[PDB]
Design a protein around this ligand. Structure first.
Ligand code: ANP
Ligand code: ANP
Ligand code: ATM
Ligand code: ATM
Ligand code: MG
Ligand code: MG
Ligand code: MG
Lengths: 209, 209
């Protein structure tokens, strides 16, 4: 009985990382075999290149960096498939959608070009999108010092995310991330249990194909 | 007056590297500003990952390695555009065509997926394809120890190259690489001078778009 592939995407400071950690914890506490993944996965060779870029310690040509972000997902695909086939549900903090939305926020990057490298990746069974109004995100401290951490760029990324959500091949669920950490968590947890229960029914799909 | 972008592609041991070096030398000797490039460009961070893979010192997931080969071209695009805009002709030993042909020789890699990462790269003004019958390539010593250096895989790559050559958006020229080094060189040199003279007329194109 395979595991589910659940991705969390969402606006700046909406709580992707907090909710992904809490979700894995709660699923395991409820008897599921679930494990957390995140992209970028900064531990691999490619992941280090990406981390340096995001910290502004290095500059990387925009197309090159886009392909490295995708390659960083592909190198984890054998693991993702193995775990899911072993019945382990994977909760993933960001995935190909952030890949497309952030590069697509740059000038002269079509959504189509941005999607292609990720075509064929394991298709998520559930894509949660954590929505939060900017006034509310602002109360969540201040921007970080990493690349892309500024309102105007975030806004362009958000427009890209909205285009991706028009894709009905994907099980997108909107989450109101303005509530408390615990309230948001319960919303996510229940959506997740439902997905886990239905994923054991159809084979793992391929993204964007 | 911009430089031309000339790529050399071709079968195993057909003489891509020998002819690219000789071409640059001859162009410079004839008053052109020309410089040699090669892919993979093994000197960069990404290039080292690729070199390790090709030497079989490391294993890389097939999709990841494909995207690294493309990223290795993109990271050189600012240089390529700068040089061409300065009037420097660039002679390139392998390019996106080898990228597509070698990954596309693997099982379950469509030509379409393989092309996408490279869509938008500087379009070559001239693509030379060095053709050589296997009996003739065999007289050119023995296979190397690197990955992909075996007859069956080379044959599949060759079929992919033939599909790419159906693309009329590109100025493909076939070269009979069975002749002597000097004879092949003269054929290439003359094709190249012609291209250099016409490239100063239309802007640099974008590949596969
Ligand atoms: N529902 C919430 N209410 C209030 N604060 C929250 C909530 N969720 C997260 N936070 C806090 O806001 C900050 C951002 O949380 P985090 O889960 O790291 O966001 P994120 O969505 O991963 N942001 P980023 O990865 O930078 O886009 C952290 O200090 C969290 O404790
Ligand atoms: N026309 C030719 N006649 C005879 N030997 C040749 C010719 N061209 C190249 N060679 C030799 O064959 C070997 C392969 O040449 P080289 O130019 O390195 O090929 P290549 O096309 O780059 N092969 P590879 O990069 O391995 O696909 C070298 O020893 C060359 O000296
Ligand atoms: C997974 C992924 C993330 N990103 C971005 C989103 C984030 N930048 N911001 N803001 C950054 C990762 O931030 P975190 O490491 O905090 O998740 O990289 C890409 O640009 N492409 C990708 O493929
Ligand atoms: C440029 C490029 C080369 N290649 C291959 C062709 C070659 N393998 N063989 N045989 C190898 C480079 O060989 P040379 O370094 O000798 O040119 O990488 C790819 O697989 N993808 C690419 O994008
Ligand atoms: Mg986070
Ligand atoms: Mg397409
Ligand atoms: Mg060579």
């Amino acid at each position: 009985r395979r595991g589910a592939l659940i991705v969390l995407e969402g606006v700046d400071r909406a709580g992707k990382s907090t909710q992904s950690r809490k979700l894995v914890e709660a699923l395991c506490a409820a008897g599921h075999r679930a494990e957390l993944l995140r992209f970028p996965e900064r531990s691999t060779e490619i992941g280090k290149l990406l981390s340096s870029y995001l910290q502004k310690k290095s500059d990387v040509e925009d197309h090159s960096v886009h392909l490295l972000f995708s390659a960083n997902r592909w190198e984890q695909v054998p693991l993702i498939k193995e775990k899911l086939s072993q019945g382990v549900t994977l909760v993933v903090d960001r995935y190909a959608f952030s890949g497309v939305a952030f590069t697509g926020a740059k000038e002269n990057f079509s959504l189509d070009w941005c999607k292609q490298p990720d075509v064929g990746l394991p298709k998520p069974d559930l894509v949660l999108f954590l929505q939060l109004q900017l006034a509310d995100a602002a109360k969540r401290g201040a921007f970080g010092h990493e690349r892309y951490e500024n309102g105007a760029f975030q806004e362009r990324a958000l427009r890209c995310f909205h285009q991706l959500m028009k894709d009905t091949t994907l099980n997108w669920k909107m989450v109101d991330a303005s509530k408390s950490i615990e309230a948001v968590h319960e919303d996510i947890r229940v959506l997740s249990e439902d997905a886990i229960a239905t994923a054991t029914e159809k084979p793992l799909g391929e993204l964007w194909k």
